[PDB]
Amino acid sequence: RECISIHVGQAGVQIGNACWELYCLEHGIQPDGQMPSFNTFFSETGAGKHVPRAVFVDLEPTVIDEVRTGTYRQLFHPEQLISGKEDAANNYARGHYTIGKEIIDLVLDRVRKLADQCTGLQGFLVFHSFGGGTGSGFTSLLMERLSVDYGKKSKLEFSIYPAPQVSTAVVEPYNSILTTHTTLEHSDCAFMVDNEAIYDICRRNLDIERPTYTNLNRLMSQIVSSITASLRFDGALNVDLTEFQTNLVPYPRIHFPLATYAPVISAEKAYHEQLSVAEITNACFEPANQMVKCDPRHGKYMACCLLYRGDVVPKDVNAAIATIKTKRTIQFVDWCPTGFKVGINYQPPTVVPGGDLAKVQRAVCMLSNTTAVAEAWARLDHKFDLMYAKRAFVHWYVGEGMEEGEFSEAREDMAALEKDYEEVGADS
Amino acid sequence: RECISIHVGQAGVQIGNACWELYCLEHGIQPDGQMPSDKTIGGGDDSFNTFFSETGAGKHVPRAVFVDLEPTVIDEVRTGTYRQLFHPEQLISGKEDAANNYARGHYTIGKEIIDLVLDRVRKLADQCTGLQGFLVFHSFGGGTGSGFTSLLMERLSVDYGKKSKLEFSIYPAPQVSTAVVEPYNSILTTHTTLEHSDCAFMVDNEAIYDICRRNLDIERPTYTNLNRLMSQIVSSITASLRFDGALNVDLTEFQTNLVPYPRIHFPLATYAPVISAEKAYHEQLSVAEITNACFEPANQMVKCDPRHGKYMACCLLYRGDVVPKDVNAAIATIKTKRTIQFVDWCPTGFKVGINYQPPTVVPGGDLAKVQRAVCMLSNTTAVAEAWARLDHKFDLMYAKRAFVHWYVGEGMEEGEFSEAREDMAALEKDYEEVGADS
Amino acid sequence: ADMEVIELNKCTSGQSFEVILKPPSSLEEIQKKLEAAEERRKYQEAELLKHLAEKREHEREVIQKAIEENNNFIKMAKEKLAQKMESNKENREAHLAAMLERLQEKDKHAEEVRKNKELKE
Amino acid sequence: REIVHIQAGQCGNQIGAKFWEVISDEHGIDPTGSYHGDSDLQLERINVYYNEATGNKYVPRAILVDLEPGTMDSVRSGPFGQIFRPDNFVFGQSGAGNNWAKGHYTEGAELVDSVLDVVRKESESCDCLQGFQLTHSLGGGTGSGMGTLLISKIREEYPDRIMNTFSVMPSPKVSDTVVEPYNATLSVHQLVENTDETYSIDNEALYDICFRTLKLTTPTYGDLNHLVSATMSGVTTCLRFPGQLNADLRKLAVNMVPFPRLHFFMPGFAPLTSRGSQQYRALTVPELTQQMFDSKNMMAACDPRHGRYLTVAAVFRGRMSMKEVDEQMLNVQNKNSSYFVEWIPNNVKTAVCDIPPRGLKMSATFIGNSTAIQELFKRISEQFTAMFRRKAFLHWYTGEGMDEMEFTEAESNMNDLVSEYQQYQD
Amino acid sequence: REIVHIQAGQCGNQIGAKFWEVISDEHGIDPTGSYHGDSDLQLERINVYYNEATGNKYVPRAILVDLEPGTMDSVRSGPFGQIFRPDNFVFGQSGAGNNWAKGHYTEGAELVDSVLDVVRKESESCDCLQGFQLTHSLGGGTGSGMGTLLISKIREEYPDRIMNTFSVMPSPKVSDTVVEPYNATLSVHQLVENTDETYSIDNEALYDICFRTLKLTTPTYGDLNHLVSATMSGVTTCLRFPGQLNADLRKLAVNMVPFPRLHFFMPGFAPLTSRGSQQYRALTVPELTQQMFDSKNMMAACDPRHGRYLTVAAVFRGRMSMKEVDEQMLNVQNKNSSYFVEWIPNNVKTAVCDIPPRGLKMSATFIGNSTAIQELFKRISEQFTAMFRRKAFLHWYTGEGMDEMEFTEAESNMNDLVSEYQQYQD
Ligand SMILES: Nc1nc2c(ncn2[C@@H]2O[C@H](COP(=O)(O)OP(=O)(O)OP(=O)(O)O)[C@@H](O)[C@H]2O)c(=O)[nH]1
Ligand SMILES: Nc1nc2c(ncn2[C@@H]2O[C@H](COP(=O)(O)OP(=O)(O)OP(=O)(O)O)[C@@H](O)[C@H]2O)c(=O)[nH]1
Ligand SMILES: COc1cc2c(c(OC)c1OC)-c1ccc(OC)c(=O)cc1[C@@H](NC(=O)CS)CC2
Ligand SMILES: COc1cc2c(c(OC)c1OC)-c1ccc(OC)c(=O)cc1[C@@H](NC(=O)CS)CC2
Ligand SMILES: Nc1nc2c(ncn2[C@@H]2O[C@H](COP(=O)(O)OP(=O)(O)O)[C@@H](O)[C@H]2O)c(=O)[nH]1
Ligand SMILES: Nc1nc2c(ncn2[C@@H]2O[C@H](COP(=O)(O)OP(=O)(O)O)[C@@H](O)[C@H]2O)c(=O)[nH]1
Asked: How close is the nearest chain D Cα to the Cα of C45, in Å?
């Protein structure tokens, strides 16, 4: 019925702010408010404003202050913007225990205050940084608690899995592994988004030597538009959240779909296009055009699912999937039919005007869940291991109140998931 | 912060008076008093006040006590110009003489004046917000120089716990008129002295006398002849705490620097270029050489040699036109063609201090005008040589009780004598002991 | 491929449909775990306030036991002075008023044996 | 967050005089005067180093401590002397000492409070705290001694808030003074127990930099000093400046230091010294980096070589492209990949900031938590142990009120660190 | 300090008349008259020997004692007779005796007081005391006897203040007189107990000087006497004069005498004699010194030789250079190094004073604490013991009121001294 967006953590927020903009630019909301089946995310105010169903929560100011600064300043109730004095200083310890505890009851209030006006809320979309301070720490604690005050209502995490170059920090592995252990039973489905792969795309097709922070976001927001949307403008493949895990995740364990946005190409080239209804599909089936830095050609597939947008009638998709089959490494794991639940949406795939991506006459999306997302689970777990094999940074947490046997036993769970994954995988 | 000069004993006094003059000739106080240089006295905020307190509105007055148990000496000062320089109170004279024995000064005729001295002493450091100690000048051997001094010292270390004490002692050489009984006196005082003293500049007369025959070329070395020489050493030893500059500051930390082990350690000095007017026009002397000739057995302070005894803290004191770039690669060279001698564990020292200030000498003097001058305060296990050169003199006199009773009479005990030499016994062994190692 | 694709839903702005290609073939009374956080913090830090409340009043002690190690120097040999400088008056008024008490018996022996001229012719 | 400054000691107080007046030049402050500089950035996070007061004018968040007037009227009568709020001037009257004991016990806990209690105001005054940073000589007294004390009293009034020191570990060529090790080894103990970061600026390099590589005949106290001043400038840039991401000093601790024992980063700096031919400005980026990872170019005597790096961080300076920087650093962990801890992944992080320092169109600065640094320690420790050998010049602390064994239980702490620092080549 | 003078006996009273009038000539005094001498020094330390009175005029600090008028009006009707203050004249009326007993008991303690009590005035008068010096014959009576008594009574009225005697130990050739040894040995006892210094001027030398080296056929009492007068002159010079360092007479005792037993210095003098024979002037310094360390150039019969010196002091007279004196003396403890006590270090000290005596451009005087001096004793003791043998002329002291055994306990006191004097060649 209705949908809340919780943004937590520097990343989370900046993705939020710069994706919530692509929301407006699609339903036509002037910052102000008035836009002279779309209320899926927003609730209509007094008589003029259009206001999101949003919470932005960080433990610094900075991030949220610039939302209270740059136009859009006009878009929110100042209440939906929760800022919190002392910073999470880059550790799950902080967020989840010390400085988190302090703000969690206040957030959790305005959260309610929002789904309260909303007759039949159907769940949450939580955006957060995989590693790093409040993005990992608070998130978890947020999640723990939501799964309490709202039993049913499912939860979709959009996590920004941190790549070496696009500024991490030493302690990250710890933080991602930490949260993602204590997160995963409270989450239903989870869109992992590896930065490398977004960053790569940006050097690749967008052709930016530098890939800018907000450069990466405009990209991802688009994925995020296309992943939502089906429930925003309405029109199936998943019109509701509990339809996400129906189609994408077979086994309790939160399964992490990888996505694959279709035609990114740079204005400069905005006039080469109208791109092959086949090809968009066929280039989306590309290691090089991914989302997470793996490859699904060295790991079996267990639920494919394309999300289309724009001028596309099925008779194309169809004998264009057949062909996306015959000259391809298919890979369907023993028992999951040979999926592809597809959804066209008609809706011009509107992109940002001060952007780098250009106007498009149709775009794809692909939400596939595969035993190769499992690569990213040890690419991380290695970093972890040999840091932990010398306790590396341990105490900066144990100080702020954690136990050793947290760390020990959380990695002793990824141990299972990593074995869980590759296990269900390819059979006899 | 501020500094008192106590002068006790004929020597002590005459060094004082003829040193305090080199004090005046440097800061510009013509007896009279006023140094028509800047201000102070209308608000004594100058760096020169280290030793003086500004009077009424004109005269400049030392922070001094002169104390002797005869007149004569001090009457000198009340006679010769400078008569105008002191409050008559700072000059304590005391009727009957100390007659050449520690017995006298420290017990009989000392007891009588000590309480009066100890008064004007206070009365001086009382105006003085943050006195930092005493400079006691006295004769090593001989009457009130040894006797009273000790008593003085015993007592100061009482009425002023903290405030450290520097003794300048004139260790007595055979020819430059001693007296038989001396050994006794010096060994006496220096036992009962040494736990109340912090640091001690022994100045052997021979070596000073020697220098005067040597470079000054006087067949006769006059009493006031030796003093002008020594006053210069004394100037240079002080000074760092007298006028100032970023250059260098106090011996407050040149002690810190000089003596490592409770026992008072007796630094030897080595003033730089002594040369006689008649030759005031050969000079501008090698910034290297002044250094290099100050590192010389023949140019010393005490009659020893630091080339048959290890070194445990070197420390040059420079004055006049000298920028470091010189000293520096001129120390390396006072390091290669030399018997270095650094004992096992005291790095390889030389804390140094230039002072810029023209090394002004006396006008009716014999020393001449100088462009730059060194000082060298090195503490060495070779100063221990002078410790038995004396102790031998003692022993074999005492090995027949020689002059004993002249004390026992005036009230001493035998077992003072016995147990005092039983302490130099330790110092002499302490010394040579800490020395050279494996 | 020879695929079929049974058709699922139609909206004012959409459509969905399967295209299957080849046979298939919480509860939280448990935030006690969160007070605990601080039970460990405000311990592990209310015990670096009391491993350091210590670093403290030894400082205000060390410099108090030198004021103690020097009060007690006026204590000893700063009075050894007075009852050694008394073991002077003692030692002299003995050797003096006893050089007077023999140079005074050439008085009795010189007067009560000069009144010997009581003999006389 | 926002940080306040404790400057303590003849050293600590030039070190910072010289510091202030190169940072004040960056954001651009007259003696008190406001801001005059046609590039707008500056005032962003001038919050950090400046509490702003009456009129458009500025005042640093600094507090000055010395146990003898002298070296304060050095600052007032001097460079940017008119800048500091007079009751941020805590002069000790008394006698410095220049022997730790004096500064940490007797003449020290004499002042302490007046200091401690102005920090109290300035701190509990500023909007929300970060930590404290203090500067000092780690040898001699008042500062080596008073200072170590302050931090050992800050901690407790300020426990959650963390700790920064610029501590000039001293040497034998450049200032003699038969005692230094004693004070140093005393403070090395001190530091290791209760800061979370300390920069180990060693004079033995600072002098040897100024010689070997920088003409300077007989290197001054000033002309020298300068190096550190420019070194602190970089080491702060990223807390002092942009929006290219923030710097919670914490967020800098809990990343630089794996192991509680405050592992002292040896620093380094890129260009150096003089108006001449580094002032020719062709200081390129390749030529800059492989000069920042140099032996001869670090502030601590200590070649990485004899010790791998734990974690390292670099801060770059000027309109230059990371197109080149990213790629130039990612070469140094190659034609040097061997001497970098295996086990801590992205243990090299770098940041770029586009506003140059005093002069110099290009500059970089280096932060180095490396095992090698124990070379500095294994050094002072044996300069020490060889004195504490024949229980040396120690009667100087004997009597000022210490115990015989406090010298041991601090020798045997350093001499410890030595060998977990050694221990960490596994 | 300042010293007063007791002059007692026929001898003691010329000895000093002649003394006064050669010291009075040095500082230059008329009969009473002021000072007349174009060389300015003189009056420095004329305090010592002269209390100054009414008008510019002068008066010696001297007191004169005799137990028969005669030898007083010798001084008044004589040389510098008008000089002494009349109540410093204590004449005894009575009969001298010339037997110690009379002067120490009977006719002595008859006068005693009148003396004792003018000494009291003159002394307790002068600004601060030094001690007393007395002159006398050690044989015969009044002065040998009255005197020894005075000092034994001064001591007690003046104990802290110390003691000096010129005592003419008598001989057999030049004055016969049955008795002398008796008086001498009686006084020798006396002295040894309670003076700190006594000059042993012996007549057996004094005569033998005047003979075998000084033509003088039948040597007078005057022409002879003279020697001593000039001897006392030197022996006082350095208390009497310069600023070339002082002379507490004490300083002179507790330096000359190692051993309480007042060891009587044998003196000697440099040039000698002549009315009809002195024209030399060419009295050189070499030629002076090895003439002062001569056998028959001493005032005591006694050659050093048969005894080492304990301590010696010499005082030199005239414009002459120590360049030469320092070096000449330091040759005598070489060419003669053997006969000087091993064990008392700089036991030879000398002093130089640039004002000649009567006549004589150059002169030196000798002070000789030497063991050998027991030679003078071992002599009088055996001159005595050979009389006390057959209990000889003793019925003369028998009856005047003495005990039989006081002669023994004074023989056996001298006979003692003898052999600690002998005892001290170890
Ligand atoms: N994709 C993307 N990732 C970001 C962005 N900003 C930070 N990150 C990533 O997220 C991680 C850091 O997470 P933060 O959100 O900054 O951590 P936090 O404590 O929650 O946020 P702070 O309150 O600022 O400390 C790093 O691995 C970054 O690569 C962004 O704008 N876009
Ligand atoms: N250097 C130096 N030594 C002196 C001087 N006068 C005396 N002496 C020496 O000092 C020692 C004598 O000590 P004094 O102070 O004269 O004796 P005192 O009893 O203490 O003082 P007085 O009562 O004057 O004797 C001897 O070694 C002499 O050589 C002098 O002017 N200069
Ligand atoms: C004072 O300002 C600074 C503050 C910090 C850093 C830093 O670089 C050295 C600074 O510059 C001087 C920093 C450091 C270290 C890291 O480990 C090497 C890291 O990953 C990360 C960082 C900093 N930056 C980031 O985490 C984005 S990469 C945060 C802490
Ligand atoms: C006249 O006044 C005299 C006074 C003194 C001395 C002396 O003998 C030369 C005198 O002349 C007779 C004297 C004595 C003896 C010493 O030992 C031989 C001595 O070292 C020292 C001295 C005298 N000299 C000194 O103190 C400098 S040597 C002190 C007392
Ligand atoms: N380079 C730097 N070091 C200094 C400076 N002054 C003194 N030092 C060093 O610090 C030590 C002396 O400590 P100092 O600060 O002068 O004594 P304090 O006043 O008691 O702190 C020596 O090792 C010097 O090398 C200076 O300002 N800059
Ligand atoms: N040399 C010296 N001895 C004298 C002189 N007059 C008398 N005597 C000696 O002194 C001794 C007698 O002392 P005298 O003074 O006559 O007796 P008194 O008056 O009773 O003391 C004899 O040995 C004389 O030789 C004198 O003028 N000079």
From this structure: 8
